[PDB]
Scaffold this active site. Structure first.
Site, PDB file in Angstrom:
ATOM      1  N   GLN A   1       0.824  -1.204   0.000  1.00 51.78           N
ATOM      2  CA  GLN A   1       0.000   0.000   0.000  1.00 51.78           C
ATOM      3  C   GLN A   1       0.861   1.257   0.000  1.00 51.78           C
ATOM      4  O   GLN A   1       0.563   2.223  -0.713  1.00 51.78           O
ATOM      5  CB  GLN A   1      -0.943  -0.016   1.203  1.00 51.78           C
ATOM      6  CG  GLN A   1      -1.579   1.325   1.525  1.00 51.78           C
ATOM      7  CD  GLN A   1      -2.918   1.184   2.224  1.00 51.78           C
ATOM      8  OE1 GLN A   1      -3.244   0.124   2.758  1.00 51.78           O
ATOM      9  NE2 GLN A   1      -3.699   2.258   2.229  1.00 51.78           N
TER      10      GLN A   1
ATOM     11  N   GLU B   1      27.738   3.535  -9.527  1.00 43.68           N
ATOM     12  CA  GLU B   1      28.548   4.550  -8.866  1.00 43.68           C
ATOM     13  C   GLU B   1      27.884   5.035  -7.581  1.00 43.68           C
ATOM     14  O   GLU B   1      28.571   5.406  -6.625  1.00 43.68           O
ATOM     15  CB  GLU B   1      28.797   5.703  -9.835  1.00 43.68           C
ATOM     16  CG  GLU B   1      29.295   5.223 -11.192  1.00 43.68           C
ATOM     17  CD  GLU B   1      29.556   6.357 -12.159  1.00 43.68           C
ATOM     18  OE1 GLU B   1      29.098   7.479 -11.887  1.00 43.68           O
ATOM     19  OE2 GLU B   1      30.181   6.121 -13.213  1.00 43.68           O
TER      20      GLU B   1
HETATM   21  N1  LIG Z   1       5.269   7.530   3.898  1.00 42.96           N
HETATM   22  C1  LIG Z   1       4.222   6.729   3.727  1.00 42.96           C
HETATM   23  N2  LIG Z   1       4.113   5.572   4.471  1.00 42.96           N
HETATM   24  C2  LIG Z   1       3.050   4.751   4.303  1.00 42.96           C
HETATM   25  C3  LIG Z   1       2.060   5.065   3.383  1.00 42.96           C
HETATM   26  N3  LIG Z   1       1.132   4.085   3.422  1.00 42.96           N
HETATM   27  C4  LIG Z   1       1.509   3.164   4.338  1.00 42.96           C
HETATM   28  N4  LIG Z   1       2.691   3.568   4.899  1.00 42.96           N
HETATM   29  C5  LIG Z   1       3.459   2.846   5.929  1.00 42.96           C
HETATM   30  O1  LIG Z   1       3.376   1.458   5.671  1.00 42.96           O
HETATM   31  C6  LIG Z   1       3.295   0.728   6.878  1.00 42.96           C
HETATM   32  C7  LIG Z   1       2.428  -0.516   6.692  1.00 42.96           C
HETATM   33  O2  LIG Z   1       2.588  -1.040   5.390  1.00 42.96           O
HETATM   34  P1  LIG Z   1       1.343  -1.140   4.371  1.00 42.96           P
HETATM   35  O3  LIG Z   1       1.803  -1.111   2.933  1.00 42.96           O
HETATM   36  O4  LIG Z   1       0.385  -0.005   4.642  1.00 42.96           O
HETATM   37  O5  LIG Z   1       0.608  -2.536   4.706  1.00 42.96           O
HETATM   38  P2  LIG Z   1       0.674  -3.759   3.658  1.00 42.96           P
HETATM   39  O6  LIG Z   1       2.050  -3.888   3.052  1.00 42.96           O
HETATM   40  O7  LIG Z   1      -0.364  -3.551   2.584  1.00 42.96           O
HETATM   41  O8  LIG Z   1       0.322  -5.073   4.521  1.00 42.96           O
HETATM   42  P3  LIG Z   1      -1.104  -5.804   4.350  1.00 42.96           P
HETATM   43  O9  LIG Z   1      -2.205  -4.775   4.257  1.00 42.96           O
HETATM   44  O10 LIG Z   1      -1.364  -6.725   5.517  1.00 42.96           O
HETATM   45  O11 LIG Z   1      -1.068  -6.618   3.081  1.00 42.96           O
HETATM   46  C8  LIG Z   1       2.725   1.684   7.914  1.00 42.96           C
HETATM   47  O12 LIG Z   1       3.467   1.600   9.109  1.00 42.96           O
HETATM   48  C9  LIG Z   1       2.865   3.068   7.311  1.00 42.96           C
HETATM   49  O13 LIG Z   1       3.719   3.866   8.097  1.00 42.96           O
HETATM   50  C10 LIG Z   1       2.162   6.227   2.631  1.00 42.96           C
HETATM   51  O14 LIG Z   1       1.289   6.517   1.813  1.00 42.96           O
HETATM   52  N5  LIG Z   1       3.247   7.057   2.808  1.00 42.96           N
HETATM   53  N1  LIG Z   2      36.643  15.540 -18.861  1.00 43.37           N
HETATM   54  C1  LIG Z   2      35.439  15.023 -19.204  1.00 43.37           C
HETATM   55  N2  LIG Z   2      35.041  13.867 -18.619  1.00 43.37           N
HETATM   56  C2  LIG Z   2      33.850  13.301 -18.926  1.00 43.37           C
HETATM   57  C3  LIG Z   2      32.981  13.969 -19.906  1.00 43.37           C
HETATM   58  N3  LIG Z   2      31.878  13.207 -20.017  1.00 43.37           N
HETATM   59  C4  LIG Z   2      32.028  12.142 -19.186  1.00 43.37           C
HETATM   60  N4  LIG Z   2      33.204  12.204 -18.532  1.00 43.37           N
HETATM   61  C5  LIG Z   2      33.735  11.227 -17.547  1.00 43.37           C
HETATM   62  O1  LIG Z   2      33.538   9.874 -17.967  1.00 43.37           O
HETATM   63  C6  LIG Z   2      33.523   9.035 -16.808  1.00 43.37           C
HETATM   64  C7  LIG Z   2      32.509   7.909 -16.962  1.00 43.37           C
HETATM   65  O2  LIG Z   2      32.744   7.187 -18.166  1.00 43.37           O
HETATM   66  P1  LIG Z   2      31.855   5.890 -18.510  1.00 43.37           P
HETATM   67  O3  LIG Z   2      30.385   6.233 -18.456  1.00 43.37           O
HETATM   68  O4  LIG Z   2      32.163   4.745 -17.576  1.00 43.37           O
HETATM   69  O5  LIG Z   2      32.300   5.534 -20.014  1.00 43.37           O
HETATM   70  P2  LIG Z   2      33.819   5.103 -20.326  1.00 43.37           P
HETATM   71  O6  LIG Z   2      34.672   6.342 -20.460  1.00 43.37           O
HETATM   72  O7  LIG Z   2      33.848   4.330 -21.617  1.00 43.37           O
HETATM   73  O8  LIG Z   2      34.362   4.237 -19.217  1.00 43.37           O
HETATM   74  C8  LIG Z   2      33.156   9.931 -15.637  1.00 43.37           C
HETATM   75  O9  LIG Z   2      34.195   9.893 -14.654  1.00 43.37           O
HETATM   76  C9  LIG Z   2      33.030  11.330 -16.207  1.00 43.37           C
HETATM   77  O10 LIG Z   2      33.659  12.301 -15.365  1.00 43.37           O
HETATM   78  C10 LIG Z   2      33.484  15.232 -20.499  1.00 43.37           C
HETATM   79  O11 LIG Z   2      32.808  15.866 -21.338  1.00 43.37           O
HETATM   80  N5  LIG Z   2      34.686  15.678 -20.109  1.00 43.37           N
HETATM   81 MG   LIG Z   3      -1.919  -4.709   2.295  1.00 35.59          MG
END
Ligand SMILES: Nc1nc2c(ncn2[C@@H]2O[C@H](COP(=O)(O)OP(=O)(O)OP(=O)(O)O)[C@@H](O)[C@H]2O)c(=O)[nH]1
Ligand SMILES: Nc1nc2c(ncn2[C@@H]2O[C@H](COP(=O)(O)OP(=O)(O)O)[C@@H](O)[C@H]2O)c(=O)[nH]1
Ligand SMILES: [Mg+2]
Lengths: 184, 242, 192, 427, 430
Positions: E11, E245
């Site tokens: 939920q 990362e």
């Molecule tokens: N932040 C946030 N927490 C929620 C929300 N709805 C439920 N919760 C949290 O979820 C917890 C319970 O889990 P639920 O998902 O509501 O219950 P369930 O998983 O459906 O379990 P069953 O109904 O028995 O199948 C509660 O303690 C709430 O704090 C929401 O809309 N926002």
């Molecule tokens: N200097 C520089 N670094 C870049 C640029 N674009 C991406 N990077 C670097 O590329 C790195 C990631 O590369 P990745 O996605 O793994 O592709 P890969 O280079 O083939 O390994 C990161 O550390 C970025 O900082 C750019 O325009 N200039």
């Molecule tokens: Mg439920």
């Protein structure tokens, strides 16, 4: 329809228990009736179809005459109570060759001619609830020769009490099955 | 100004309004700004990787600013001009393509020409007949269709073109300027260039008359020397060794 | 010729195996739900051959690499299904797009290498196959003295024709060359 | 008489190479679609080095772009010079890496190899003189580092004599963008040491530091950093294309700078660099170039030479200048800082001049040096790697690829041996 | 191109998903019908014409929560097969939702997600949402994680859960469900984030000028963090941080894989008018124990890793300046074997506002992820509360009759003891 819907284990097509058992089903009635009641032999609900003209009182699935089913499982298991009267039902399937094929069995049938359009199968039951099992892939390859392709339409005629129509991926013997998908 | 500030003045009152900073941050310096054709309160400023939209509210005597959506076509901008309507704006780039940006939805929609022009676009102006004229540092003046910015025609001149002007509601002539101090006009019908007045590109520091005849006078300047006619003010010779 | 509907899509939506692309293992591009040895070859492989005609993912990636893996792991069983592969293979070639034919030639090269008996069984089927090759044979380009990049796409379709034709010529046997002449006038034998 | 085929792996590397082609085309006067419209006849003296001509007056560049996901290639095609590249020049894989160095090298590398090799192949027998390829890649990532190291081995096998000139960006040690990075850089270093003839190290931290020391760009972007890298690449390869008065090529620079086979990692630098507004005040001369080149605030490498000593150095100049003035500087700055020159390797500094400077920047210079200060770089990645390795949680990610756990140790042992080699050589 | 698939279990998770996809479409410019009036391939799929479909699957054992989505305004955007609704709920029983009811629908869910993953060629991780106290969120989620581990192997499975608040509670059986879920989660999860509603209530009341918020405001706050976290892979930036990362930065040890989150500047639509909200101001505000949404004081513990993401006008200098400035804080402790301990990512795309939202028109913002020993503060709280239940066997009969063996409770307790003990050795210095 049901084409990509996940299909493993059991996929049921009719069950007498529910708020609308004949929801996806179609009704056509002449000189008879389709009624639902509790059967003492099983102490549970069952659908009752009785008519003087079995040929003019049937149920079919789906509702839409143009649409077709897409159930993937090759085995169709029927559970019904024999009313010591004339009974028939029919199935429509497709094959590798893309001919639409129709199988209609009967209890008042005489022979088993397999002329191209529609196969006919004579059959005999035991008075009471029966568990006819149809292996569509085995039957299609045995009669026409081509492999099995997914099922299009299923129709059931009058003079029977039916409470279970489901498909199974394979041939299940007794007790490797949920407790409801069997006979009391 | 050169300090990335835009100041709006009131012509009627001869007084200014609040100044602002053209940049936001990770953009860079600002290069050009222009007004809209049909709205006094709408004007567009441009900078490197930064095109901004501005609207003026007359109650507080200030103006708000709006930025362009994050398109990956990173380029510097030299000059801009809006279309005949407010729906489109066109921008020139240092690298040779003209960017077309929708004013309503603040997004770039196309880049052209498909074969760009050398050393970017140094002058741009929408022609009165709903078409785009551009100038380049290579020395070519070309016309790009307003639809998808595909080149339709173009002519060549000397030097780096720095200014292109078209008389409003006129289709006959186009004025062009050059870093060579050349003033030239292009006839739109036959698409041929004509030169009206030459000049020196830099400081001139010597002049001399041949004693045999006074109708000619020679000059020397940084970049080369010239021969001019005194009776009718035209040149006849240019020799340059960079 | 419209895109004749590919059976592989209809087999893939419900039953086909190669969906598995998941690895915590020292494995290649694709994985199988079940070991291919247990599978039959009359139903799966002809469907796989039809899948090379697909143009969009994930169908063509699975079909192309699934065909390669099946031909590599099970070269003994494919001889029985050789006649059934002519029809789906002939469907793919008639598309004439410069991308499908590259996949088909890669499969064919991977096919003739499996068994000299297979190539001898493909001699009667040359007439059903070669007309596409006989069209595209001479589509190379003249550049003089400067550089060819196309081969990293592996898409210089003419060079694929030359090596592949050389492969059937070696494994075809005694009567492969005369059939090739009957389909390819500009070919000259590379038997030695 | 010197044709170079340029290879780009890396999301970083592909963007850097594209900006390099922007610089070359502006320098040569090439339309981003390849049609010549320039103004200098000297631009066509040696244009065959970087370009091919297609029938129709169109020039195609010797550019290879390598990636494993089509996102970067789609970005490159959206670039200005996307049409300049021949459409077949691009290849991209079909199963991404996510900077997993082991995944790219082992699983994706083997499949990629049979395709990628053959432009490296067919450029070689048709690039009119192959005396070196050129590779730009990142070390912290998984796609560029793993694939580039793998292809460097195949380049060495297939092309032994041809010089494998590599430019790499070192992991930023304060903070870099990826953090699988210490594992990736450790494994790539062992592959890079043995095969690559020349390796050049660049750090983004120094680039940002330089931007705010010199450029005073209040708010720089990636475009500026890659543009500076393009300037270095233009300065390095300028001597091959244009005249001068004294010129050194890649093989000369390898001869002049490399004293021992494993001591070939070099720092790179460019001068002059000035803020956009203060350039008017500055009087650009040779002593101004020399002071800028050797000033620590201009080094593009995160390693202070003052913490070490210099082994060999190289300086190149673009434009017309007096050789006496250049060599006057080279003596007096060599004598000024004798505490930084090794006693038993004199003649550390080398000089060169090229005739044609870039556009607008009348006088230009590029400096490449060798100093023991490199030891700090490997120490930082080793220190970060040690406690990361001390709890093997992350190697199981790489083990599931097929990489053995012992593979990390031999790279670390080679790294320590490389550190030790530079330590003895200081004395 | 590069793809991420999201699942929203329970939920709580489904309601969180609705806020996120509302924020995505506004950020992406996609209408509720899927049409338009880029990196859309990362989160949406194109079916021709002009329609796009999210890569999301909603799972819950009660139809009412799913039916709200099926009848909402966004009902046209989603695909009918994506929304999965159960027949009868787990009744806040981990046993009921894991063995009796979960096993009926576990294999139905797997096919639909696995079929969706085929379309994602560039897929490099899944997002999974939980509620620890819920029966379905914990019982079904634990089994689904177990199946996903063997099915996909070395693919990243990011999790984002709602840890129970120290004092604010909704279910009495909460300690039982949370410990069992963690025992299954500690081995299969690649990385999992934690937030508690009590700290969210305090932050949204103090910072945002809301007198009495609801779950909708809390989901909007969570969605902003998720959108900022995933914005690196979608839009261009001066520094790009990938999913792997985000993983290895924070979790130098396997069992110590638990980070905590905080966001700044969370400022009301009227008070932002009086401040600069520069990078230095927002960078310092993150470390404030008031802003972080997990009620465990980091000044009692230590810092072991930190990761920053900047969205807006942020610049290489003042990031480097702020990081140096933060390092000079003597109220902040780092272990010596973590000398660097930081990362930043820089993205140009500014955060997106929401109609009817509770945020201000901010130009720059920062999202922060860090790992700290302070998480051990709440774990002892959970252990003590569990011990009170388990000493007198106050709720054993519900769980035992619904399927597990009784011996699993001491197994989970021992796993918690080892996990707390593992964090303690890591906290020490040698
Ligand atoms: N932040 C946030 N927490 C929620 C929300 N709805 C439920 N919760 C949290 O979820 C917890 C319970 O889990 P639920 O998902 O509501 O219950 P369930 O998983 O459906 O379990 P069953 O109904 O028995 O199948 C509660 O303690 C709430 O704090 C929401 O809309 N926002
Ligand atoms: N200097 C520089 N670094 C870049 C640029 N674009 C991406 N990077 C670097 O590329 C790195 C990631 O590369 P990745 O996605 O793994 O592709 P890969 O280079 O083939 O390994 C990161 O550390 C970025 O900082 C750019 O325009 N200039
Ligand atoms: Mg439920």
């Amino acid at each position: 329809m049901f084409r990509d819907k996940y299909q493993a284990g059991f996929l049921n097509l009719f069950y007498s228990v529910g708020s609308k058992p004949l929801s996806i089903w179609e009704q056509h009635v002449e000189n008879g009736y389709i009624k639902r009641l509790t059967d003492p032999d099983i102490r549970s609900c069952v659908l009752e179809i009785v008519s003087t003209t079995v040929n003019n009182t049937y149920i079919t699935c789906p509702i839409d005459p143009k649409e077709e089913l897409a159930i993937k499982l090759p085995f169709l298991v029927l559970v019904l109570k024999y009313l010591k009267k004339y009974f028939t039902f029919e199935i429509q399937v497709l094959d590798d060759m893309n001919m639409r094929r129709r199988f209609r069995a009967s209890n008042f049938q005489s022979k088993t001619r397999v002329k191209p359009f529609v196969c006919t199968l004579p059959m005999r039951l035991d008075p009471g609830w029966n568990q006819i099992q149809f292996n569509l892939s085995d039957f299609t390859r045995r009669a026409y020769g081509t492999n099995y392709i997914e099922t299009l339409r299923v129709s059931v005629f009058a003079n029977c009490r039916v409470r279970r129509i489901y498909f199974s991926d394979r041939l299940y013997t007794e007790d490797e099955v949920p407790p409801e998908y069997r006979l009391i | 100004g050169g300090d990335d500030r835009i100041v709006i003045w009131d012509v009627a009152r001869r007084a200014g309004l609040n100044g602002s900073t053209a940049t936001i941050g990770s953009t860079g310096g600002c290069n050009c700004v222009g007004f809209s054709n049909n709205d006094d309160q709408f004007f567009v400023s441009a900078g490197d990787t930064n095109v901004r939209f501005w609207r003026i509210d007359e109650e507080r005597r200030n103006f708000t600013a709006d930025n362009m959506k994050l398109d990956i076509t990173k380029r510097n901008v030299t000059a801009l001009s809006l279309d005949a309507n407010d729906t489109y704006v066109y921008c020139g780039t240092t690298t040779g393509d003209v960017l077309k940006v929708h004013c309503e939805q603040k997004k770039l929609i196309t880049v052209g020409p498909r074969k760009p022009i050398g050393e970017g676009i140094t002058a741009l102006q929408v022609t009165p007949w709903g078409d785009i004229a551009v100038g380049s540092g290579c020395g070519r003046v070309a016309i790009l269709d307003a639809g998808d910015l595909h080149a339709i025609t173009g002519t060549d001149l000397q030097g780096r073109v720095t200014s292109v002007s078209v008389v409003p509601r006129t289709n006959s002539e186009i004025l062009c300027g050059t870093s060579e101090s050349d003033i030239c006009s292009i006839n739109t019908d036959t698409f041929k260039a004509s030169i009206l007045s030459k000049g020196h590109s830099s400081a001139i520091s010597d002049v001399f008359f041949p004693e045999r005849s006074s109708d000619m006078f020679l000059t020397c300047s940084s970049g080369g020397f010239h021969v001019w006619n005194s009776r009718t003010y035209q040149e006849l010779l240019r020799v340059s060794l960079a | 010729p419209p895109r004749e509907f590919t059976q592989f899509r209809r087999f893939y939506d419900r039953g086909d195996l190669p969906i598995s692309r998941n690895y915590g293992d020292e494995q290649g591009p694709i994985h199988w739900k079940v070991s291919p040895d247990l599978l039959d070859y009359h139903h799966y492989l002809p469907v796989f051959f039809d899948g090379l005609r697909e143009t969009e993912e994930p169908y063509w990636y699975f079909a192309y690499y699934g065909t390669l893996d099946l031909i590599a792991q099970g070269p003994t069983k494919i001889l029985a299904v050789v006649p059934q592969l002519i029809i789906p293979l002939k469907k793919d070639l008639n598309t004439r797009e410069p991308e499908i034919l590259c996949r088909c030639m890669a499969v064919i090269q991977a096919l003739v290498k499996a068994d000299p008996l297979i190539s001898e069984a493909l001699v009667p089927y040359y007439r059903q196959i070669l007309p596409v090759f006989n069209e595209f044979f001479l589509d190379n380009k003249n550049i003089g003295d400067r550089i060819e990049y196309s081969q990293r796409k592996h898409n210089n379709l003419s060079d694929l024709i030359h090596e592949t034709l050389e492969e059937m010529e070696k494994s075809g046997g005694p009567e492969a060359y005369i059939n090739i002449k009957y389909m390819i006038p500009s070919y000259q034998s590379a038997v030695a | 008489v010197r044709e170079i085929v340029h290879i780009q792996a890396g999301q970083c590397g592909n963007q850097i190479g594209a900006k390099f082609w922007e610089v070359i085309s502006d320098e040569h006067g090439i339309d981003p679609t390849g049609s010549y419209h320039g103004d200098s006849d000297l631009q066509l003296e040696r244009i065959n080095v970087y370009y091919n001509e297609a029938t129709g007056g169109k020039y195609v560049p010797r550019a290879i772009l390598v990636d494993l996901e089509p996102g970067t290639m789609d970005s490159v095609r959206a670039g200005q010079f996307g049409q300049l590249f021949r459409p077949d020049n691009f290849v991209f894989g079909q199963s991404g890496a996510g900077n997993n160095w082991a995944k790219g090298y082992y699983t994706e590398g083997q499949e990629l190899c049979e395709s990628i090799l053959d432009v490296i192949r067919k450029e070689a027998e048709s690039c009119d003189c192959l005396q070196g390829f050129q590779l730009v890649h990142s070390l912290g990532g998984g796609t560029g580092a793993g694939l580039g190291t793998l292809l460097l081995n195949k380049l060495r096998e297939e092309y032994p004599d041809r010089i494998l000139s590599t430019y790499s960006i070192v992991p930023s040690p304060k903070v870099s963008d990826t953090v699988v990075e210490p594992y990736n850089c450790t494994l790539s270093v062992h592959q890079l040491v043995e095969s690559a003839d020349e390796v050049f190290c660049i750090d983004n931290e120094a680039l940002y530091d330089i931007c705010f020391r010199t450029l005073k760009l209040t708010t720089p972007t990636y475009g500026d950093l890659n543009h500076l890298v393009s300037m270095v690449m233009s300065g390095t390869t300028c001597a091959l294309r244009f005249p001068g008065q004294l010129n050194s090529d890649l093989r000369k620079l390898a001869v002049n700078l490399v004293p021992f086979p494993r001591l070939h990692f070099f720092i790179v630098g460019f001068a002059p660099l000035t803020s956009r507004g203060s350039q008017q005040y500055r009087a650009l001369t040779v002593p101004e170039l020399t002071s800028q080149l050797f000033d620590n605030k201009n080094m593009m490498a995160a390693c202070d030479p003052r913490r070490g000593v210099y082994l060999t150095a190289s300086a190149h100049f673009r434009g017309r200048m007096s050789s006496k003035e250049v060599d006057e500087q080279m003596l007096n700055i060599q004598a000024r800082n004798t505490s930084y020159f090794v006693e038993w390797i004199p003649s550390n500094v080398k000089s060169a001049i090229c005739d044609i400077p870039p556009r607008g920047l009348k006088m230009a210079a590029t400096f490449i040096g060798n100093t023991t200060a490199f030891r700090e770089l490997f120490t930082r990645v080793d220190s970060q790697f040690q406690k990361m390795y001390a709890r093997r949680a992350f190697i199981h990610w790489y083990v599931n690829e097929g990489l053995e756990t012992v593979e990390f140790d031999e790279a670390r042992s080679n790294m320590t041996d490389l550190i030790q080699e530079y330590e003895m050589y200081e004395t | 191109m590069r793809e991420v698939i999201s699942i929203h279990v329970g939920q709580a998770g489904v309601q969180i998903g609705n806020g996120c996809w509302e924020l995505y479409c506004l950020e992406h410019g996609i209408q509720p019908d899927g049409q338009l009036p880029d990196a859309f391939n990362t989160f949406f799929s194109e079916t021709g014409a002009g329609k796009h479909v999210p890569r999301a699957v909603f799972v819950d054992l009660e139809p009412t929560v799913v039916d709200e989505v099926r009848t909402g305004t966004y009902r046209q955007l989603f695909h009918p097969e994506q929304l999965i609704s159960g027949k009868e709920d787990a009744a806040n029983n981990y046993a009921r939702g894991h063995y009796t009811v979960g096993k009926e629908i576990i294999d139905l869910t797997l096919d639909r997600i696995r079929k969706l993953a085929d379309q994602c060629t560039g897929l490099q991780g899944f997002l999974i949402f939980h509620s620890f106290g819920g029966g379905t969120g914990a019982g079904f989620g634990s089994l689904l994680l177990e199946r996903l581990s063997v099915d996909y192997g070395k693919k990243s499975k990011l999790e984002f859960t709602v840890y129970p608040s120290p004092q604010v509670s909704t279910a009495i059986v909460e300690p039982y469900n949370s410990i069992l879920a963690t025992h299954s989660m500690i081995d299969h999860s690649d990385c999992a984030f934690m937030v508690d509603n009590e700290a969210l209530y305090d932050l949204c009341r103090r910072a945002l000028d809301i007198e009495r918020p609801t779950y909708t405001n809390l989901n909007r706050l969570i969605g902003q963090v998720v959108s900022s976290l995933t914005a690196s892979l979608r839009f261009d930036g001066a520094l790009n941080v990938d999913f792997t990362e985000f993983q290895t930065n924070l979790v130098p040890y396997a069992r110590i894989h638990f980070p905590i989150c905080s966001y700044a500047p969370v400022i009301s639509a009227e008070k932002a008018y009086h401040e600069q909200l520069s990078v230095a101001e927002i960078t310092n505000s993150l470390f404030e124990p008031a802003n972080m949404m997990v009620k465990c004081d980091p000044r009692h513990g230590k810092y072991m890793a930190c990761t920053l993401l900047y969205r807006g006008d942020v610049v290489p200098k003042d990031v480097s300046a702020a990081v140096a400035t933060i390092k000079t804080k003597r109220t902040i402790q780092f272990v010596d074997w973590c000398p660097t301990g930081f990362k930043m990512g820089i993205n140009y795309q500014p955060p997106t506002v929401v109609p009817g939202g509770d945020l201000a028109k901010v130009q720059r913002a920062v999202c922060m992820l860090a790992n700290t020993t302070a998480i051990a503060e709440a774990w002892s709280r959970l252990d003590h509360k569990f011990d009170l239940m388990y000493a007198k066997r106050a709720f054993v009969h519900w769980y035992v009759g619904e399927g597990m063996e009784e011996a699993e409770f001491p197994e989970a307790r021992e796993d918690l003891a080892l996990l707390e003990k593992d964090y303690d050795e890591v906290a020490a210095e040698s």
